[PDB]
Amino acid sequence: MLIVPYNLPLPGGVVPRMLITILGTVKPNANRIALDFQRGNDVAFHFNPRFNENNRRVIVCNTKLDNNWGREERQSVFPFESGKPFKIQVLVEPDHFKVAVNDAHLLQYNHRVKKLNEISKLGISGDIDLTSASYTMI
Ligand SMILES: CC(=O)N[C@@H]1[C@@H](O)[C@H](O[C@@H]2O[C@H](CO)[C@H](O)[C@H](O)[C@H]2NC(C)=O)[C@@H](CO)O[C@@H]1O
Ligand SMILES: [Cl-]
């Protein structure tokens, strides 16, 4: 198992047709998982499954600029389950990050950070056993 939190360098940032794949298993009684696509200290795309926000499960997505979180985008469709293996695929498209979980489309997140080639790290954190994190150009 990879050590969490895990940093995956994205050399030269991201670009349309880059596909990032995260394989792992949610811990029992998980609280949160997070993917942070970072541009330096900024977070271009934060993808944050929350397993117990007021006894509901929700995915919170956002951007952090100059240390300030912006307007959250919330998705109530929640494909993760404590104790179970998952696959997250993040496909960079011209206008958005497109996320599928377990081969089913989940959400899109419009690019707020415009300098895609400066989004050069992916941080993976939270209540998972992390099996692998990789990228490929499709
Ligand atoms: C309903 C609502 O607006 N809740 C927010 C809450 O989600 C937010 O918590 C932060 O949210 C960002 C994403 O927007 C990250 O997930 C942060 O990790 C998370 N910070 C903490 C300490 O959990 C807080 C703080 O911005 O403000 C509202 O409560
Ligand atoms: Cl930008």
UniProtKB/Swiss-Prot annotation:
Expression (tissue specificity): A major expression is found in the colonic epithelium. It is also abundant in the activated macrophages. Expressed in fetal membranes.
Q: Give the gene symbol.
A: LGALS3
General function of this protein: Galactose-specific lectin which binds IgE. May mediate with the alpha-3, beta-1 integrin the stimulation by CSPG4 of endothelial cells migration. Together with DMBT1, required for terminal differentiation of columnar epithelial cells during early embryogenesis. In the nucleus: acts as a pre-mRNA splicing factor. Involved in acute inflammatory responses including neutrophil activation and adhesion, chemoattraction of monocytes macrophages, opsonization of apoptotic neutrophils, and activation of mast cells.
The organism named in the record is: Homo sapiens (Human)
Q: Output one GO BP term.
A: negative regulation of T cell receptor signaling pathway
Keyword entries, A-Z: Acetylation, Cytoplasm, Differentiation, Disulfide bond, IgE-binding protein, Immunity, Innate immunity, Lectin, mRNA processing, mRNA splicing, Nucleus, Phosphoprotein, Repeat, Secreted, Spliceosome
Q: Which residues carry this modification: Phosphoserine?
A: 76
User: Oligomeric state and partners?
Assistant: Probably forms homo- or heterodimers. Interacts with DMBT1. Interacts with CD6 and ALCAM. Forms a complex with the ITGA3, ITGB1 and CSPG4. Interacts with LGALS3BP, LYPD3, ZFTRAF1 and UACA. Interacts with TRIM16; this interaction mediates autophagy of damage endomembranes. Interacts with cargo receptor TMED10; the interaction mediates the translocation from the cytoplasm into the ERGIC (endoplasmic reticulum-Golgi intermediate compartment) and thereby secretion.
- What is the protein's name according to its record? Galectin-3
Q: Which residues bind a beta-D-galactoside?
A: 69-75
Membrane-crossing ranges are none
Which residues of the entire protein appear here: the answer is 114 to 250 of 250
